[PDB]
Amino acid sequence: YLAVTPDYVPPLNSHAFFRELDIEVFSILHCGLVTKFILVVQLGPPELLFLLEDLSQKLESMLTRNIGFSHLQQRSAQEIVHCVFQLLTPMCNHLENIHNYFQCLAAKVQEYHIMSSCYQRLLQIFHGLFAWSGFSQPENQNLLYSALHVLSSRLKQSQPLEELLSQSVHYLQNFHQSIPSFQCALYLIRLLMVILEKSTASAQNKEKIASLARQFLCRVWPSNISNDQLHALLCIYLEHTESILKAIEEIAGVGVPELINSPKDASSSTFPTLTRHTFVVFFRVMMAELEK
């Protein structure tokens, strides 16, 4: 009925007109997830997306106008992150289940889209949680340690802090294979960087960020990729690679020539994300990075 109704004003931008959900509503995320395809009353894929979308918007409003967030703003950011932290364990479980979901599609369509949105919402929540300016303060480092210990406990369980980061990154990096969309890959990449920021030694940390970034660039993403997101990924790959000059030489000296020889509606073999329509993004990043 919204489609047949262009002009109409709802009685008193969904958050502007819909009632705010309490922060305690997300406590029902402890329910498991079951899908109709390729896997009492239990949480469904559309219901999970509804809860994840609302939680992501709440985090984006404080950690990253007041209409639709009056009750949320009435609690300080310290409690909101702490409240989300209590959701970490049931929320990593949803990520693992969806990760196991996409792996089984190695060998209906609306279900795929809903789970894809759920995957991206989880990573955005995960990234927004750890990438909080409050973690720079020393008072809540214990809270950060507890969050990092949760991820490290998903594989094997007063450990040293650096061990938690290495384990947490290793646990999260395993999700790259299951990622179904470019936006999810960018969210995982950004999530890895903010965690690796806490680690002082980044000689190898830069390479694993760069190696993962190149793999996403070289992957054949099914078709959707926006130039803004592709621009963001190129900056991450170039700023983190060991030799930016050799990286630029490879894209411009190998990737671009084979793009020209390829058909008009085609892409580079080495860089499938490099087509005639996205060349400007590659060119703009390479020139800007070279100048920097």
From Swiss-Prot:
Please tell me in which tissues this protein is expressed: Highly expressed in germinal center cells of the spleen, tonsil, and reactive lymph nodes, and in the proliferating basal layer of squamous epithelium of tonsil, esophagus, oropharynx, larynx and cervix. Expressed in cytotrophoblastic cells of the placenta and exocrine cells of the pancreas (at protein level). Highly expressed in testis, where expression is restricted to maturing spermatocytes.
Post-translational modification summary for this protein: Deubiquitinated by USP1 as cells enter G2/M, or once DNA repair is completed. Monoubiquitination requires the joint intervention of the FANC core complex, including FANCA, FANCB, FANCC, FANCE, FANCF, FANCG, and FANCM, and proteins involved in cell cycle checkpoints and DNA repair, including RPA1, ATR, CHEK1 and BRCA1, and is mediated by FANCL/PHF9. Monoubiquitination prevents DNA release from the FANCI-FANCD2 complex. Phosphorylated in response to various genotoxic stresses by ATM and/or ATR. In contrast, phosphorylation by ATR on other sites may be required for ubiquitination and foci formation.
Q: Please give the coiled-coil regions recorded for this protein.
A: none
- Enumerate the subcellular locations listed in this protein's record, separating them with semicolons: Nucleus
- What's the stated role of this polypeptide? Required for maintenance of chromosomal stability. Promotes accurate and efficient pairing of homologs during meiosis. Involved in the repair of DNA double-strand breaks, both by homologous recombination and single-strand annealing. The FANCI-FANCD2 complex binds and scans double-stranded DNA (dsDNA) for DNA damage; this complex stalls at DNA junctions between double-stranded DNA and single-stranded DNA. May participate in S phase and G2 phase checkpoint activation upon DNA damage.
How does the entry describe the domains? The C-terminal 24 residues of isoform 2 are required for its function.
User: What disorder is listed for this protein?
Assistant: Fanconi anemia complementation group D2: A disorder affecting all bone marrow elements and resulting in anemia, leukopenia and thrombopenia. It is associated with cardiac, renal and limb malformations, dermal pigmentary changes, and a predisposition to the development of malignancies. At the cellular level it is associated with hypersensitivity to DNA-damaging agents, chromosomal instability (increased chromosome breakage) and defective DNA repair.
The UniProt family comment states:
Belongs to the Fanconi anemia protein FANCD2 family.
Quaternary structure annotation from Swiss-Prot or TrEMBL: Homodimer; cannot be ubiquitinated and does not bind DNA. Part of a FANCI-FANCD2 heterodimeric complex that binds and scans dsDNA for DNA damage. Interacts directly with FANCE and FANCI. Interacts with USP1 and MEN1. The ubiquitinated form specifically interacts with BRCA1 and BLM. Both the nonubiquitinated and the monoubiquitinated forms interact with BRCA2; this interaction is mediated by phosphorylated FANCG and the complex also includes XCCR3. The ubiquitinated form specifically interacts with MTMR15/FAN1 (via UBZ-type zinc finger), leading to recruit MTMR15/FAN1 to sites of DNA damage.
Q: What is this protein called?
A: Fanconi anemia group D2 protein
Underlying gene: FANCD2
Of the intact sequence, the residues represented are 829 to 1244 of 1451
